Design a protein around this ligand. Structure first.
Ligand SMILES: CCCCCCCCCCCCCCCCCC(=O)OC[C@H](COP(=O)([O-])OCC(O)COP(=O)([O-])OC[C@@H](COC(=O)CCCCCCCCCCCCCCCCC)OC(=O)CCCCCCCCCCCCCCCCC)OC(=O)CCCCCCCCCCCCCCCCC
Ligand SMILES: CCCCCCCCCCCCCCCCCC(=O)OC[C@H](COP(=O)([O-])OCC[N+](C)(C)C)OC(=O)CCCCCCCCCCCCCCCCC
Ligand SMILES: CCCCCCCCCCCCCCCCCC(=O)OC[C@H](COP(=O)([O-])OCC[N+](C)(C)C)OC(=O)CCCCCCCCCCCCCCCCC
Ligand SMILES: CCCCCCCCCCCCCCCCCC(=O)OC[C@H](COP(=O)([O-])OCC[N+](C)(C)C)OC(=O)CCCCCCCCCCCCCCCCC
Ligand SMILES: CCCCCCCCCCCCCCCCCC(=O)OC[C@H](COP(=O)(O)OCCN)OC(=O)CCCCCCCCCCCCCCCCC
Ligand SMILES: CCCCCCCCCCCCCCCCCC(=O)OC[C@H](COP(=O)(O)OCCN)OC(=O)CCCCCCCCCCCCCCCCC
Ligand SMILES: CCCCCCCCCCCCCCCCCC(=O)OC[C@H](COP(=O)(O)OCCN)OC(=O)CCCCCCCCCCCCCCCCC
Ligand SMILES: CCCCCCCCCCCCCCCCCC(=O)OC[C@H](COP(=O)(O)OCCN)OC(=O)CCCCCCCCCCCCCCCCC
Ligand SMILES: C=C(C)[C@H]1Cc2c(ccc3c2O[C@@H]2COc4cc(OC)c(OC)cc4[C@@H]2C3=O)O1
Ligand SMILES: C=C(C)[C@H]1Cc2c(ccc3c2O[C@H]2COc4cc(OC)c(OC)cc4[C@@H]2C3=O)O1
Lengths: 167, 105, 70, 347, 110, 98, 99, 314, 96, 80
């Protein structure tokens, strides 16, 4: 049961999206997307992407969904929602029952039903996280990427100040 | 259009993140470095039409390194026959696959 | 006078002293009288699991030296 | 808007298109589309009225959904190929998702439902940018992935675009919506010949950009956004009615005009590949857009109209509007058919 | 694993104390209150400046996200390129701040 | 293939169907769009970490940063709609039907 | 071609500009210490700015100077301590100089 | 055995937060030429106990809320985040020794604004929502300089590891090469925790005026559970103590004394100044701290390269 | 002071890395015998399990090449108990 | 050049300190002599294994042992 923990989080992740795509309100939609970001971040952290998991927490949840909740507060002061929620939940639990009774499934692609602990690597990486040094490579190998991203963010600041002015 | 400015000016804008076989930081290999290298060296220069049919075996080896569908299928078959013989009782696990042997190195 | 604030400061200081001394004594207790092994990097984890194998008692902290080889 | 900031934002639109055109890595393709969208959003909100905010919001949602589908296509390509080259895709699911996403960025049917609205809500210069410059980057990506494009999907999208662009502009009196349904129909004409000969796709793209640039430049020169204000042009400047005459006759595909040039070549490249029925019904549908062009120039451009007395004030002032490249674009959008073998420079 | 134990323990202790806080004085039968604010019932007006400082936070937080691998990037062998791109990113953050300055975006929450 | 990939793609398609046909708050559409971005982040991260392809470790951060900037842009459009109608109901965005 | 459904569609405006289809009013009542006691304030704000400030007083109106008319001069003297009740002997001195 | 370590972390946190109220009232008393509590306990030592029991037996509001569920989730998230900030703190050894503890604490402290936002949602008072939005914009403003100052210092650390930061300061305190970072950091942590002169929750009515004594005592204590933590974090970051690995309690006494003096420095700042106007601290962040913080971030990028003092990666 | 101490710390890091380098051939030899041990044990247990299945080749490579492929995690720890599986698959990630 | 500088140092000393520290951070690594040693130390740090070479017969500059006098040395780092 502990061997499938990534898989278990993934189920919650799917559930979390059906939690907010049913859309009772942007308030509870934001709450569901924050819980979904937490559990998908747990998925990322369980493969060794610790820096990318802390980028989910710092930038997605701590940076951006704060601004979504802020704008939901300031600008935005059932049957369809609950029905779409229970519909997606029944679809996902029938998928879980299929893939656990069969250990093989095909919706669009062919998917194994064992846990994803098998597909890892048996080596080590010495005195570094490979993911950390690959993100450190943004400044040494990623010059053009830094240029286009910084120009896009500068243009993003300029564009926000243009269209929020109204004049 | 693909205006190949990077080759005309001789600059390396984004060829480096393109494949797994490229120069990585601290010489870290990808898991399928050898397979991708073999498939790239097969399909080089012969065009995509000849590459889809003349480099099928390297590409199948590389896609099966990436996804491990055949390996997981074989592990499913072995684990399923093992579970059947455990349920029937015609097989017993050895002490080195039950965790009673105090590993080697 | 001003030394009346010192009993509350001393109580709060004991409350801040307890977690650090606690985790120091617990890490010395659970690791064979020594510091907890820090495995930030995969080489450290490989050496630590190799220690757990070569100890023979399924503990990384049980150290084996020259007496273990002939 | 500050003209320096306007120059910087237009250079960022151009820079995003250039990054999509030149880059070898799929992430930089996605980055170029993100840069292009993020930069073009203020060009649509130049006049700051609620129609432009609605148009920019609809454009944002369509291009953002298209960009997410593009990144999902890139990610499935990474699953099934382990690499990032902008070349053919290595999964038909990535092929379908990227064809859908580029169809959303072009405005092809069944994702056409924003192109008549957004073009209506934004000014004529930003609508010119939307219907000409924003077609260059997804046609470049479609030009580079055509070994992986499913033929049935691209032909379904193409003929659906041609039928909806044909039967959507029959009802239209707004000039920007006529240009938008014309856009949808011409993108169908470009993408149906894509897997047969992509040079004729580029030929159709360049002739379309010339004719669309001519039409929006005449619209800005006359300040006419409707059919009825276009009818009031002969009493102000008679040559402008002649130019919208010849350019609308060219966009439907009359011989011997230049807009007959691409689609004829397209039919010429579809019968080589033994497709007879498809370019036949394709040009049957193009006869319907030519037919409402001929109503929209016969009934309401040629035979002269009741005017208003205030127009006799406007006789005393000439046009000081910068009609940039307008005679060159009007000559090229009409009189280029004798140079039809120029297309080989696009090979 | 021990991390999840710690997080679960903190969530458990917080939920325990919050439930005891919400339900230990609900044992009391104090009184039932009817009780029939600066604004009375007016709708909350949108403040444009609060939204502008939230988006300015979001964009500078993204520029921070680009800045975050610098202690690892200082360990590279391509230090001239790395130092150039680091100074370029902090300069572009400063240019975004200067444009936010001079276009009066930082006013009445300066 | 991997089984967690099916769940991440199913999450992506759930938020994609939540974006497409509801005709509700505009903020709910932006929430579905950023859920699509979240699932793309998770899926790119699990693939790049799975294959040990080191240079693409900076790729999801890029996928974060641009798209979060994109999100900021969307909110400003919403605020302009929120400065026009008082609501973010997308059925107020029907001026351009005619 | 206007059909039965596409019949209420009026043309868009000629300049493509539609009409745009208010400021906050706060009531800081007698529930507040940094106003020095008993004051109601009807603020009219425009964001951070104060457009209008309407003080409502009378929350300590006690009819002092109607009570003074029914008391003698010596009996009326301690009312003046209780007017400016951090300036007691100054108000005593003002009333005493008057008398 | 690990659960004993978690409990001896988190129960003394709540006790230290309880007696921090007494230390606040006493130290503010003597600075104001008076006494703090000395009646309830001997030298006031039973005042936090009596106060916590008094709050836990008051009637709660249970008002008409826009959300009951977020009215419940705001104290739970507040206490849970206030307790999880302490788990990578190396004193001298942490509960959870992680490679990215600094970035962990930055991310979890960025998550703390949802307590303020949900507490502003849960009260139906629109003015409490306005004050919550002002508090959130204050906190997200100063998180920017927290992130950039912390990045500039970790350029001298070499990693995101909090225990490496003890090895970093074995010769000199890191306040000597980074005192402008240290003083902007200290004022920014003061502005993070809604602490005077940056508090805007007592006067022009805060976000947590809806809460009365059931959740409020929890909110408050979670808030002070941040404050000590931030000072402890500042103590790790700029005032790194001597660590003898054979006597760890030397480090524990040394960092405890420094963290107490720094929390008392918070108390001594709030008793000495008036408050900011709201746009004045927005002026303080966006126009005074942020250009200097960018300039010093450029200086701490280029400085180890130009002195050949790039710190070790491991 | 930070200049002198970070130069000293870089010298100490080089010393630690050279101790690692000097130990790496012995660790490489033990790791090679470790993985060939586990593959040979899985091969013998497959040979004693997979006899009921018709058309089965024991130890059949799924790769068309004859190059040595680095063994996957579920290839080595596929027939062992869940404790050793969980250790070898999430121990370093879950370590403290 | 000193009237405007004294004026901005009297009005905006925060921005004067900001632009001065930023200017020093830009220009000073191009003037420091120690910037070479940063590069030299970051390439002297052995993250990977020093993979040996097959002795073809003629490689005099490659040592046969770590303690041999030929090869790269770190005496510049031990002295500094
Ligand atoms: C290669 C592709 C070239 C594409 C065209 C490039 C130029 C146009 C785009 C930029 C632009 O708008 O420039 C202004 C633009 C004028 O556009 P306009 O405002 O629409 O013109 C209306 C009146 O002419 C406005 O008149 P004015 O009162 O302002 O003054 C008269 C003006 C004054 O002229 C000058 O001042 C020019 C001398 C100084 C130049 C700058 C020196 C520094 O002279 C002209 O404008 C004469 C006409 C110029 C030619 C326009 C068309 C160019 C050829 C387009 C390609 C045709 C391809 C056919 C293919 C057929 C087969 C498929 O061009 C110029 O002023 C100079 C054109 C130079 C052409 C060079 C050709 C060789 C290139 C190699
Ligand atoms: C304003 C532009 C500032 C940065 C300009 C490039 C700085 C630099 O040294 O880049 C070197 C880097 C890297 O070169 P390098 O010299 O580090 O190459 C060594 C090889 N590697 C990276 C594998 C270790 O980039 C390039 O040379 C090419 C990409 C960017 C080219 C400049 C684009 C400017 C666009 C402006 C719009
Ligand atoms: C986290 C550490 C601190 C925790 C909190 C402090 C520890 C002590 C908590 C329990 C104290 C006793 C119950 C709460 C206070 C009751 C005050 C009160 O008004 O009680 C009268 C109330 C009601 O008495 P009543 O019937 O007179 O009600 C008055 C209201 N009228 C007349 C209108 C109906 O008593 C109770 O509700 C009893 C609850 C249980 C009492 C304790 C049982 C044993 C606990 C061990
Ligand atoms: C961590 C341990 C403790 C750290 C120290 C903190 C303890 C003491 C705290 C005292 C009480 C503080 C209460 C809060 C006060 C908030 C208000 C305030 O101070 O605002 C900040 C004020 C803001 O300015 P202001 O508010 O005074 O003025 C108004 C602003 N103008 C002028 C624009 C109208 O100052 C700063 O922002 C300074 C921040 C630190 C500056 C560091 C400078 C470094 C020097 C570099 C060299 C310079 C020389 C020239 C170049 C040389 C080159 C070689
Ligand atoms: C990490 C460090 C943490 C430290 C936390 C604690 C700090 C403070 C420690 C205690 C300080 C002294 C407290 C003394 C309280 C007053 C005692 C007393 O005399 O109370 C008198 C009262 C009534 O007495 P009565 O008999 O009626 O008198 C008539 C006489 N003819 O009789 C009574 O009220 C009954 C007796 C009450 C005694 C209460 C004592 C304090 C309890 C506090 C709880 C925590 C204790 C410490 C926990 C950690 C150590 C184990
Ligand atoms: C294989 C592909 C490789 C690449 C090939 C090249 C592709 C070319 C695509 C051209 C797209 C042009 C889009 C429009 C020009 C861009 C800048 C712009 O919008 O300029 C218009 C400008 C706006 O000024 P403003 O003040 O805002 O006007 C409002 C009115 N008061 O000023 C005005 O409004 C003035 C009015 C006249 C403007 C006429 C502009 C004509 C531009 C198109 C020229 C023809 C296309 C080039 C040749 C064919 C190339 C395919
Ligand atoms: C309304 C909903 C409820 C709201 C209240 C409760 C939620 C909020 C408060 C709790 C927040 C939980 C945050 C958990 C993850 C924090 C990031 C993290 O784990 O970083 C630490 C560390 C990275 O460092 P590293 O040293 O590389 O790892 C060891 C490798 N040698 O990584 C590790 O050590 C990895 C350890 C294994 C993986 C840990 C996964 C934890 C569980 C996933 C998140 C659960 C919470 C989901 C909700 C979040 C908030 C919405
Ligand atoms: C080349 C070096 C690197 C440069 C890039 C990195 C910069 C790091 C700091 C980032 C700062 C970001 C924001 C900067 C905005 C600058 C413009 C500005 O503030 O102008 C307005 C100001 C008048 O102030 P006001 O508009 O009223 O604002 C309210 C305060 N009263 O007017 C002013 O304050 C006048 C500002 C210009 C004069 C400053 C001169 C400083 C000289 C220091 C010594 C030389 C340093 C070498 C570099 C030259 C710098 C000019
Ligand atoms: C956590 C425990 C054990 C108790 C003690 C306690 C609370 C809850 C809230 C508070 C508190 O202690 C003090 C009480 O007195 C003041 C007085 C103040 O100003 C006079 C002041 O200003 C910020 C703050 C306060 C604290 C405050 O709010 O629960
Ligand atoms: C109203 C619209 C859209 C079009 C259709 C139309 C006109 C103008 C004029 C005429 C016309 O209908 C045609 C019908 O058939 C022919 C056939 C002819 O030749 C085949 C021919 O030669 C001049 C002339 C005619 C008609 C003719 O005069 O504008």
């Amino acid at each position: 049961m502990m061997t499938y923990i990534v898989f278990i989080l993934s189920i919650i992740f799917v559930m979390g999206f059906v939690g907010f795509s049913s859309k009772p309100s942007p308030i509870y939609g934001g709450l569901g997307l924050i819980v979904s970001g937490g559990v998908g971040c747990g998925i990322v952290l369980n493969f060794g992407g610790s820096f990318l998991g802390l980028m989910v927490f710092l930038i997605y949840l701590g940076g951006m969904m704060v601004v979504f909740g802020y704008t939901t507060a300031m600008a935005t002061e059932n049957k369809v929602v609950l029905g779409t929620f229970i519909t997606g939940l029944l679809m996902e639990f029938l998928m879980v029952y299929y893939v656990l009774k069969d250990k093989e499934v095909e919706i669009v692609f062919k998917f194994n039903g064992m846990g994803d602990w098998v597909i890892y690597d048996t080596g080590d990486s010495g005195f570094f996280s490979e993911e950390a040094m690959g993100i450190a490579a943004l400044y040494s190998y990623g010059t053009w990427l830094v240029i286009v991203t910084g120009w896009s963010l500068l243009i993003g600041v300029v564009v926000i100040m243009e269209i929020t002015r109204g004049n | 259009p693909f205006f190949d400015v990077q080759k005309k000016l001789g600059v390396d804008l984004d060829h480096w993140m393109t494949i797994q076989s490229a120069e990585q930081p601290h010489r870290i290999p990808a898991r399928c470095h050898a397979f991708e290298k073999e498939w790239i060296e097969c399909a080089h220069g012969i065009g995509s039409i000849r590459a889809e049919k003349e480099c099928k075996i390297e590409f199948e080896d590389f896609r099966e390194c990436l996804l491990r569908q055949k390996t997981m299928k074989r592990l499913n078959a072995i684990k399923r026959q093992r579970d059947k013989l455990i349920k029937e009782g015609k097989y017993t696990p050895p002490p080195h696959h039950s965790g009673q042997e105090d590993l080697r190195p | 006078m001003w030394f009346e604030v010192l009993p509350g400061i001393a109580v709060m200081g004991v409350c801040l002293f307890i977690p650090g001394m606690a985790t120091a004594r617990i890490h010395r207790f659970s690791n064979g009288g020594r510091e907890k092994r820090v495995a930030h990097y995969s080489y450290q984890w490989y050496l630590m699991e190799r220690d757990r194998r070569v100890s023979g008692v399924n503990r990384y902290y049980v150290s084996k030296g020259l007496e273990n080889i002939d | 808007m500050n003209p320096i900031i306007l120059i910087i934002i237009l250079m960022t639109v151009m820079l995003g298109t250039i990054i999509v055109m030149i880059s070898t890595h799929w992430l930089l393709i996605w980055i170029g589309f993100e840069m292009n969208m993020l930069a073009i959003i203020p060009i649509m909100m130049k006049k700051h009225n609620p129609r432009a905010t609605e148009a920019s919001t609809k454009y944002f949602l369509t291009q953002s959904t298209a960009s997410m589908l593009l990144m999902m296509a890139i990610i499935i390509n990474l699953m099934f190929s382990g690499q990032w080259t902008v070349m053919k895709l290595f999964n038909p699911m990535a092929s379908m998702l990227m064809t859908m996403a580029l169809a959303m960025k072009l405005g092809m049917a069944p994702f056409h439902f924003w192109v008549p609205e957004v073009t209506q809500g934004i000014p004529l210069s930003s609508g010119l940018i939307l219907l000409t410059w924003q077609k260059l980057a997804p046609m470049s990506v479609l030009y580079q992935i055509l070994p992986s494009i499913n033929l049935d999907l691209i032909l379904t999208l193409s003929i659906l675009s041609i039928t909806i662009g044909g039967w959507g502009g029959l009802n239209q009196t707004q000039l920007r919506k006529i240009m938008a349904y014309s856009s949808i129909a011409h993108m169908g004409w470009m993408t149906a010949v894509l897997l047969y000969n992509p040079t004729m796709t580029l030929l159709n793209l360049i002739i379309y950009i010339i004719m669309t640039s001519t039409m929006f430049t005449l619209f800005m020169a006359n300040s006419t956004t409707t059919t009825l204000s276009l009818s009031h042009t002969w009493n102000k400047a008679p040559i402008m009615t002649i130019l919208v005459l010849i350019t609308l006759l060219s966009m439907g595909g009359l011989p011997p005009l230049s807009g007959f040039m691409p689609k004829w070549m397209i039919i010429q490249e579809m019968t080589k590949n033994d497709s007879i029925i498809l370019p036949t019904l394709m040009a049957i549908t193009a006869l319907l857009n030519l037919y409402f062009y001929m109503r929209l120039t016969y009934s309401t451009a040629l035979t002269m109209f009741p005017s208003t007395n205030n127009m006799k004030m406007k006789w005393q002032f000439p046009t000081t509007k910068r009609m940039t490249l307008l005679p060159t674009m009007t000559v090229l959008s009409t009189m280029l058919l004798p140079l039809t073998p120029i297309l080989s420079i696009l090979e | 694993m021990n991390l999840m134990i710690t997080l679960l323990t903190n969530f458990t202790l917080a939920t325990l104390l919050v439930t005891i806080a919400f339900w230990l004085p609900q044992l009391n039968v104090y009184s039932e209150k009817t009780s029939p604010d600066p604004m009375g019932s007016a709708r909350l007006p949108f403040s444009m400046k609060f939204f502008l400082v939230a988006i300015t936070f979001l964009l500078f937080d993204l520029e921070i996200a680009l800045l975050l691998p610098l202690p690892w990037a200082s360990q590279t062998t391509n230090l001239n390129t790395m130092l150039t791109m680091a100074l370029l990113l902090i300069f572009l953050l400063a240019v975004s701040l200067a444009y936010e300055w001079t276009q009066k975006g930082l006013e009445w929450t300066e | 293939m991997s089984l967690v990939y099916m769940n991440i793609m199913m999450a992506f398609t759930v938020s994609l169907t939540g974006l497409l046909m509801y005709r509700s708050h505009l903020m709910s559409s932006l929430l579905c769009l950023e859920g699509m971005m979240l699932s793309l982040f998770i899926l790119a991260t699990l693939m790049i970490l799975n294959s040990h392809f080191t240079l693409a470790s900076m790729m999801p951060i890029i996928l974060l940063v641009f798209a979060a900037c994109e999100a900021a842009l969307g909110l400003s459009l919403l605020v302009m709609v929120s400065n026009t109608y008082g609501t973010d109901y997308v059925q107020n965005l029907n001026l351009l039907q005619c | 071609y206007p059909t039965k459904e596409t019949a209420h569609w009026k043309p868009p405006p000629w300049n493509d500009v539609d009409p745009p289809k208010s400021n906050l009013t706060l009531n800081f009542g007698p529930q507040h210490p940094a106003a020095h006691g008993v004051l109601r304030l009807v603020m009219e704000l425009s964001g951070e700015m104060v457009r209008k400030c309407d003080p409502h007083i009378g929350l300590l109106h006690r009819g002092t100077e109607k009570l003074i008319e029914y008391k003698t001069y010596l009996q009326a003297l301690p009312y003046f301590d209780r007017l400016d009740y951090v300036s007691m002997m100054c108000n005593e001195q003002a009333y005493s100089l008057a008398v | 055995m690990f659960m004993i370590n978690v409990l001896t972390l988190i129960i003394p946190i709540l006790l230290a937060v309880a007696f921090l109220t007494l230390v606040e009232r006493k130290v503010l008393g003597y600075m104001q030429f008076r006494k703090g509590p000395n009646v309830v306990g001997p030298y006031g030592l039973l005042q936090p106990i009596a106060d916590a029991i008094k709050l836990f037996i008051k009637e709660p509001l249970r008002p008409a809320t826009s959300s009951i569920s977020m009215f419940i989730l705001a104290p739970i998230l507040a206490l849970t985040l206030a307790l999880t900030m302490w788990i990578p703190l190396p004193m001298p050894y942490p509960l959870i020794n992680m490679n990215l503890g600094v970035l962990f604490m930055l991310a979890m402290s960025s998550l703390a604004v949802y307590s303020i936002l949900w507490s502003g949602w849960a009260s139906n008072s629109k003015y409490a929502l306005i004050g919550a939005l002002r508090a959130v914009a204050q906190t997200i403003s100063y998180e920017v300089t927290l992130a950039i100052i912390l990045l500039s210092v970790l350029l001298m650390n070499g990693s995101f590891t909090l225990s490496t930061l003890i090895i970093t300061q074995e010769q000199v305190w890191l306040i000597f090469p980074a005192w402008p970072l240290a003083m902007m950091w200290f004022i920014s942590t003061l502005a993070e925790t809604n602490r005077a002169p940056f508090d805007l929750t007592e006067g022009e009515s805060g976000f947590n005026v809806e809460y009365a004594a059931g959740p409020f005592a929890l909110f408050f204590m979670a808030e002070y559970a941040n404050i000590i933590m931030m000072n402890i974090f500042t103590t790790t970051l700029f005032l790194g103590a001597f660590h003898n690995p054979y006597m760890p309690e030397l480090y524990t006494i040394n960092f405890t004394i420094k963290s107490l003096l720094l929390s008392i420095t918070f108390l001594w700042i709030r008793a000495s100044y008036p408050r900011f106007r709201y746009d004045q601290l927005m002026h303080l962040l966006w126009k005074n701290f942020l250009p200097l913080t960018l300039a010093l971030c450029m200086w701490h990028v280029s400085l180890p390269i130009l002195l050949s003092s790039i710190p070790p990666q491991t | 002071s930070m200049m002198r101490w970070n130069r000293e710390r870089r010298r100490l890091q080089i010393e630690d890395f050279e101790a690692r380098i000097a130990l790496m051939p012995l660790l490489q030899a033990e790791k090679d015998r470790r993985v060939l041990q586990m593959l040979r044990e899985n091969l013998e247990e497959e040979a004693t399990i997979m006899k009921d299945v018709p058309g089965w080749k024991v130890g059949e490579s799924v790769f068309h090449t004859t190059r040595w492929v680095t063994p996957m995690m579920g290839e080595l720890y596929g027939l062992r108990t869940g404790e050793e599986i969980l250790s070898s698959t999430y121990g370093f990630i879950w370590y403290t | 050049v000193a009237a405007f500088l004294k004026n901005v140092w009297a009005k905006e000393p925060v921005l004067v300190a900001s632009f001065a520290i930023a200017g020093l951070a830009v220009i000073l690594p191009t003037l420091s002599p120690y910037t070479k040693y940063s590069l030299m130390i970051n390439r002297a740090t052995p993250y990977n294994y020093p993979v040996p070479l097959r002795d073809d017969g003629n490689m005099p500059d490659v040592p046969s042992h770590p303690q041999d006098p030929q090869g790269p040395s770190l005496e510049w780092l031990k002295r500094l």
